[PDB]
Amino acid sequence: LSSVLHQRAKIPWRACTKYLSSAGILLLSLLVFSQLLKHMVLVAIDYWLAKWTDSALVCSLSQECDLDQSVYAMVFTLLCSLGIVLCLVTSVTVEW
Amino acid sequence: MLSRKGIIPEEYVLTRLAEDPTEPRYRTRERRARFVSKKGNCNVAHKNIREQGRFLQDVFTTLVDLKWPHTLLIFTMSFLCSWLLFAMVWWLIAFAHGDLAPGEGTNVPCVTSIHSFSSAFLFSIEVQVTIGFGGRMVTEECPLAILILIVQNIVGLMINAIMLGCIFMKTAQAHRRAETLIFSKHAVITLRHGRLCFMLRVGDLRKSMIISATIHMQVVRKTTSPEGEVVPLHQVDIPMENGVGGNSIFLVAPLIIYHVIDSNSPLYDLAPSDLHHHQDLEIIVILEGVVETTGITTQARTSYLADEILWGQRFVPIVAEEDGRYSVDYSKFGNTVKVPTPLCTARQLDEDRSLLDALT
Amino acid sequence: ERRARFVSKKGNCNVAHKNIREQGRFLQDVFTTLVDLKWPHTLLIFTMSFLCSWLLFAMVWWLIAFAHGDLAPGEGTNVPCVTSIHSFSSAFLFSIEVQVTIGFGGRMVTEECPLAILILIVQNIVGLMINAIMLGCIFMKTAQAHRRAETLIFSKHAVITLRHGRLCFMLRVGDLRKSMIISATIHMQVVRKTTSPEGEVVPLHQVDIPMENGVGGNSIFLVAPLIIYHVIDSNSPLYDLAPSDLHHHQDLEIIVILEGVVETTGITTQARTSYLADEILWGQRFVPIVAEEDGRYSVDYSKFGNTVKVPTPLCTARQLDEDRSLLDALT
Amino acid sequence: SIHSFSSAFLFSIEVQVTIGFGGRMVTEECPLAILILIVQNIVGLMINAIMLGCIF
Amino acid sequence: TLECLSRSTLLCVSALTVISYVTPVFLVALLPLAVVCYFIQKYFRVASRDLQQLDDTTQLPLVSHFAETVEGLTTIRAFRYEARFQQKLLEYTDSNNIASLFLTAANRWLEVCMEYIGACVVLIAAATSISNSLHRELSAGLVGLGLT
Amino acid sequence: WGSQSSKVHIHHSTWLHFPGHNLRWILTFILLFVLVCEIAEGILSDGVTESRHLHLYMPAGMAFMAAITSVVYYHNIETSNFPKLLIALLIYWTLAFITKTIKFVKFYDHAIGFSQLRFCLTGLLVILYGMLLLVEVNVIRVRRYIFFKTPREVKPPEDLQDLGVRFLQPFVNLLSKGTYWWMNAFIKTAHKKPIDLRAIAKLPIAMRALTNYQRLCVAFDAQARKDTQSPQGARAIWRALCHAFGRRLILSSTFRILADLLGFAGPLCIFGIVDHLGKENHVFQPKTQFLGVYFVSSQEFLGNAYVLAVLLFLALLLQRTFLQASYYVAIETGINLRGAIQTKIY
Amino acid sequence: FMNTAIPIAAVLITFVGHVSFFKESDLSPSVAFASLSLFHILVTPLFLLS
Numbered sequence A: 001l002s003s004v005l006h007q008r009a010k011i012p013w014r015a016c017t018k019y020l021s022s023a024g025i026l027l028l029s030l031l032v033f034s035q036l037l038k039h040m041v042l043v044a045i046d047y048w049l050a051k052w053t054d055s056a057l058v059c060s061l062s063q064e065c066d067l068d069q070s071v072y073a074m075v076f077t078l079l080c081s082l083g084i085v086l087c088l089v090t091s092v093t094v095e096w
Numbered sequence B: 001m002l003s004r005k006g007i008i009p010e011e012y013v014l015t016r017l018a019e020d021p022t023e024p025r026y027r028t029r030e031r032r033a034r035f036v037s038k039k040g041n042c043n044v045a046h047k048n049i050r051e052q053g054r055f056l057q058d059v060f061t062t063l064v065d066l067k068w069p070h071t072l073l074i075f076t077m078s079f080l081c082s083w084l085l086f087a088m089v090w091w092l093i094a095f096a097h098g099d100l101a102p103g104e105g106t107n108v109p110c111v112t113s114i115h116s117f118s119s120a121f122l123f124s125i126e127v128q129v130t131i132g133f134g135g136r137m138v139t140e141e142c143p144l145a146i147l148i149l150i151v152q153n154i155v156g157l158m159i160n161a162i163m164l165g166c167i168f169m170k171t172a173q174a175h176r177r178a179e180t181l182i183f184s185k186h187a188v189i190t191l192r193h194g195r196l197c198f199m200l201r202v203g204d205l206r207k208s209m210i211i212s213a214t215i216h217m218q219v220v221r222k223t224t225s226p227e228g229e230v231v232p233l234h235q236v237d238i239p240m241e242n243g244v245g246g247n248s249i250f251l252v253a254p255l256i257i258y259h260v261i262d263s264n265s266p267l268y269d270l271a272p273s274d275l276h277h278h279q280d281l282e283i284i285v286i287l288e289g290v291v292e293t294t295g296i297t298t299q300a301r302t303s304y305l306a307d308e309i310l311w312g313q314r315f316v317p318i319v320a321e322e323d324g325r326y327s328v329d330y331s332k333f334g335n336t337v338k339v340p341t342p343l344c345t346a347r348q349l350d351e352d353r354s355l356l357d358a359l360t
Numbered sequence C: 001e002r003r004a005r006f007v008s009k010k011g012n013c014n015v016a017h018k019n020i021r022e023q024g025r026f027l028q029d030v031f032t033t034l035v036d037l038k039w040p041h042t043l044l045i046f047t048m049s050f051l052c053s054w055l056l057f058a059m060v061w062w063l064i065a066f067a068h069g070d071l072a073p074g075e076g077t078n079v080p081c082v083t084s085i086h087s088f089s090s091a092f093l094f095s096i097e098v099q100v101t102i103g104f105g106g107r108m109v110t111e112e113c114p115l116a117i118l119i120l121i122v123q124n125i126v127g128l129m130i131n132a133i134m135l136g137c138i139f140m141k142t143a144q145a146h147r148r149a150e151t152l153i154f155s156k157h158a159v160i161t162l163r164h165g166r167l168c169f170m171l172r173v174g175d176l177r178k179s180m181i182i183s184a185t186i187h188m189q190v191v192r193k194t195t196s197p198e199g200e201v202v203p204l205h206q207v208d209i210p211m212e213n214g215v216g217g218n219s220i221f222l223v224a225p226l227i228i229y230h231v232i233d234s235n236s237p238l239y240d241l242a243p244s245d246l247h248h249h250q251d252l253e254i255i256v257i258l259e260g261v262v263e264t265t266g267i268t269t270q271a272r273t274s275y276l277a278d279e280i281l282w283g284q285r286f287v288p289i290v291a292e293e294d295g296r297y298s299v300d301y302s303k304f305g306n307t308v309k310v311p312t313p314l315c316t317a318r319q320l321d322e323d324r325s326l327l328d329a330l331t
Numbered sequence D: 001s002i003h004s005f006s007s008a009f010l011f012s013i014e015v016q017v018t019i020g021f022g023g024r025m026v027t028e029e030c031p032l033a034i035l036i037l038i039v040q041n042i043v044g045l046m047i048n049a050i051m052l053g054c055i056f
Numbered sequence E: 001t002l003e004c005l006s007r008s009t010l011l012c013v014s015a016l017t018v019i020s021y022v023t024p025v026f027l028v029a030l031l032p033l034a035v036v037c038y039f040i041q042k043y044f045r046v047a048s049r050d051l052q053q054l055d056d057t058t059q060l061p062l063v064s065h066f067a068e069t070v071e072g073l074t075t076i077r078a079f080r081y082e083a084r085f086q087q088k089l090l091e092y093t094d095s096n097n098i099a100s101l102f103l104t105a106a107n108r109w110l111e112v113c114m115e116y117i118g119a120c121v122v123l124i125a126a127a128t129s130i131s132n133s134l135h136r137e138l139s140a141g142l143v144g145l146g147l148t
Numbered sequence F: 001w002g003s004q005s006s007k008v009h010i011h012h013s014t015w016l017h018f019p020g021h022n023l024r025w026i027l028t029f030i031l032l033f034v035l036v037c038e039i040a041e042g043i044l045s046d047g048v049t050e051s052r053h054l055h056l057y058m059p060a061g062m063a064f065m066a067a068i069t070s071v072v073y074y075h076n077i078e079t080s081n082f083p084k085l086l087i088a089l090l091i092y093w094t095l096a097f098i099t100k101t102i103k104f105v106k107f108y109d110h111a112i113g114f115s116q117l118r119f120c121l122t123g124l125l126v127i128l129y130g131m132l133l134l135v136e137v138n139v140i141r142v143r144r145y146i147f148f149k150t151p152r153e154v155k156p157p158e159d160l161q162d163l164g165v166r167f168l169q170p171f172v173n174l175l176s177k178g179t180y181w182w183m184n185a186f187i188k189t190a191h192k193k194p195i196d197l198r199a200i201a202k203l204p205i206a207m208r209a210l211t212n213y214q215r216l217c218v219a220f221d222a223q224a225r226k227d228t229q230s231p232q233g234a235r236a237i238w239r240a241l242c243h244a245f246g247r248r249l250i251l252s253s254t255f256r257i258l259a260d261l262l263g264f265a266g267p268l269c270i271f272g273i274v275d276h277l278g279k280e281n282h283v284f285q286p287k288t289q290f291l292g293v294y295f296v297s298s299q300e301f302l303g304n305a306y307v308l309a310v311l312l313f314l315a316l317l318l319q320r321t322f323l324q325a326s327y328y329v330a331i332e333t334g335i336n337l338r339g340a341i342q343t344k345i346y
Numbered sequence G: 001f002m003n004t005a006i007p008i009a010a011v012l013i014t015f016v017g018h019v020s021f022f023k024e025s026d027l028s029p030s031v032a033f034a035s036l037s038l039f040h041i042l043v044t045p046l047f048l049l050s
Ligand SMILES: CCCCCCCCCCCCCCCCCC(=O)OC[C@H](COP(=O)(O)OC[C@H](N)C(=O)O)OC(=O)CCCCCCCCCCCCCCCCC
Pocket: B053, B056, B057, B058, B059, B081, B082, B085, B151, B155, C040, F084, F085, F087, F088
């Protein structure tokens, strides 16, 4: 028989049905949102770290567009805490 | 580690019996491999060759086998490499001589007009291609220039002579004339003069005659001897039923070629009911002569598998007698029309003749 | 010593000629001798021919300038026949420029003296002749196909096994190149010191041998390796070769001559090989070689010359054909 | 020495036939001339080689 | 597997996003490199699925052979038949080992090619970032994030 | 290159790597590194001046191309069993060696000193050519084809000649051992048709379960002869495996350690690249100039951002090839252990 | 959770410590980002040597 092209199904339907008829709606959306939120924090922590070693190398609540802070510790510790908490939430959601 | 690496080395589990998996292996799509293709170009792949440089030893023969695009590139690379290498030599010798830094001084240049490497490259072109503009002469000053001039001239003449020889052997190539020899796509088995024979048609398209044509013919079947031998592809020779037995033939109009199936033929036990596609048989035809213009010998190769054969059909007559001369209507070259024939084997026909003829 | 071979396994023969009345034909065929020579020797003669010609005419150009006296310093009271010749080395460079036809033009030939005009004609004609001759020799050398004979490959040693009842001397020959050999031909000879009843003695009698072809011809179409055998009929001189009589000092040799015009250059080439007395394995059929892959065949040159043992009587062909005939008659 | 078109045509003769009078040379000024010189030499030699073979 | 797959692919997307942001001329060369990456992923998955099924279906008969040989040990040794079964095991072991070797070699093929692609990314990122920080004055902070 | 489009021999050819094959490639690799070092130095030097000074890197720039073409020529003459044609390569090494020896000594006479990197690079590259030359004559000694009357020609490996052998990793050129280039052709087969026990084929001699079992039995018998211990403890089996696979386990560890050490050069390169990129200080590369040519020293060479970025790229290549080299050796030894131990248990 | 939190927690502690309890530099990107890359290459074998 000829199935060289047929074999490469990639199982996309087998996954759509899986998530739908097994996970529901609430938890699948929570999983995706939690993963993206944690990864955006990683982007944010690297972006904030870069701008900090940049400006500090001799009203600051804003994450971006603000360069009026002698010390960047307050926002950087908060970003680290967000990353830890989101890792916990992401792990729980995936396993549950 | 992002990869799924954890504590699970055991992999101990019991799986039930599994049978009949879905896989693309129900049927073998690939057919029986052709021993030589319909345009020559035999479809046999050598393997496990213990190379010893014999391919590379005969560079000249290797150059001839190359296509014209690659031959032109090697032609170009050979000249360019020699030209540029000696350009460095001329540039370096002038630079070492010190006649490259300009000035109104006591020094007299060994090679005049050399100012940069560009002039050295142009001077190399002039010397080896014998253009000889003469604005960049060779003077009497440094004898090493005279030695290098002799070396460059000898090397240039040798490379020119070698490439000439290669081009003369490549413009005499007749592998593009052998492709105008035409064999009918499918051959037939049909009775002539009461004896069965394996007919065929071969014709020439151009007007330049091929001298001393020679039509051989071989049957390619796996053979198991009574002694038990195992020959995967045995090649049995085949006659041509010519009036003198010899393989020679004079081909102007497309002639009919047929192997009279006598008692000593390997086709002698073939029946139309066993002429399906997956039958291990093949008929090769070898039309070799010398082309009258180039004088170079040529071969034409064609093959006829089992499914290509067409039992009990006769080729359509092609030649006619028109006003000025004969005509050849090539549109009817491969047309076959069915003829009333027995379905018996050659040996079955022989048995029928053995009894019917001996009426008394 | 042990046993002289007529032709070596690589194809070169070993016969040594002696007491030849040299008539100069070796020297007479200058062009054929050059073709035979190796490329290093050909290049040496190529270089020496051109260098001698260049230097010979260079001395002539220097001589004519010295005779004309135009190489000594002059102030307008002279016009040299060959311009800018004020040294022998200038004449040498001028000779290079003329014969190679580089023609730099710094050392011209003037209209003044006619002798330089004749010498220019002679040098041009001689240069064209030598260029044409070297072209011819190089064209014949680049058209050589003796190096194609090397790609033709025979079995390490041949066998004699029963096939279709009778006995045959088998053999295998292969081609490694992708190119074809048009109009191939396989001759085969036995070389034995054969004595005759009438009293003659022949030091090496060469008996021709049929190729056991289908149509009784010498044509062979060689693409894959072929088991090229010889049916040992009554007339074949191998009809009385005892397997016990296969030891070293058995006066035997099987010449093989694979001919056929090479398609590329159009040149015919020979392939030669000799099977000695002890280089024959009785009753061992060849290993099947031509395998089949997906949609194409496959030849396994690793198993080119391997032979497996097959049972067969250890009897001479005369003791076999006669015995079989008697059994059939009795039955 | 390139003045008119006829000068360029005669220069083409001198290069391909390899006569090379040398009154119209190629200097180091424009590199494209050197590339064109290489092209013309190779093409002229290839055409000459082919015509030689056919004549032979 | 879902946690690891999603985190890995999203880390890759996040990392490529930051590299593009630091040096805007990276993404222009990313597109040809992304096409090459697509081909490598495509071909590897096709090869890896086949080798994975082969590995599974080759290791099943081996444990089955061990179990059945321990079931009928006395009968096998009665015939003096054990040379045949040792040869059968060697063929089974060789089949299992060659499946594993090809799976590992396919894995190493992918890893070498992907890490060379990553090395090309590093050179592109480093070269363009230094050039942009000597002309456009990237301020040397985004340079550090891009390199790491 | 042209003819290979019209030949089938190399479709299933048979190789024979000349004696001194493994260290020939590594020498070409290390000199391909110290030619990029010369390139980086030359580009670094001439930029501070106002002219070209092409002689700084163009010699190195063409030496780099020459080395690549040399290894390609050597490989093409290694797939075929035709040693004669590497005469050019043999004469090439000494031709470069003598010339660069003159360059090295003519730096010393002018008191160049090791303080300048170009002197160190030239000196390093001189022995890198001399040792390569010594390999090019070692091939002569073992095959005896140029001058010696009767050559001592060698057959190709016996395991390669089976048509049921297709995992040809153990016998292939060193660079394709590392980058698994030979796998690429097989991958197309996997996409074309499925991969059954037909596509893959019998494993080489060294990986056959019987070969590993034979090596294991030899190790056990040798151990029992050297030490005469009546019990066969767990330590007996442990030493047996070590004695049967030590000469490969050490190779895996060596490759892994070198990969780790070169891997840490990535972070360290980042440190240097960013640290130099501070305050946009004016370039002051040349300190000790000689005869109008600016010589770059060690720290000056490794203070340049571009030089360090290129150096980082080369370091990543070495790291990520040695790491994969370690992985394959570990897997091959582990799979051989499975074969020998499964056979031993049976 | 532990695998993905020990790198960030270590990085958090490291940066805060140098700023407050060390004050040994100005925390230039050459040191900050080099140490960040070192933490990545060290976390991978540290979490798996167990
Ligand atoms: C790659 C160069 C290798 C040679 C380097 C110099 C060696 C000088 C040899 C002088 C004789 C002394 C020792 C003899 C060595 C013989 C070498 C040789 O024959 O191989 C040359 C090859 C292959 O031939 P083969 O199959 O080996 O020949 C039969 C062999 N005797 C046998 O065992 O059966 O023949 C071929 O297959 C064709 C090779 C032609 C090479 C031409 C290269 C291009 C040159 C273009 C640029 C010109 C450069 C000019 C520089 C001038 C500088 C002043």
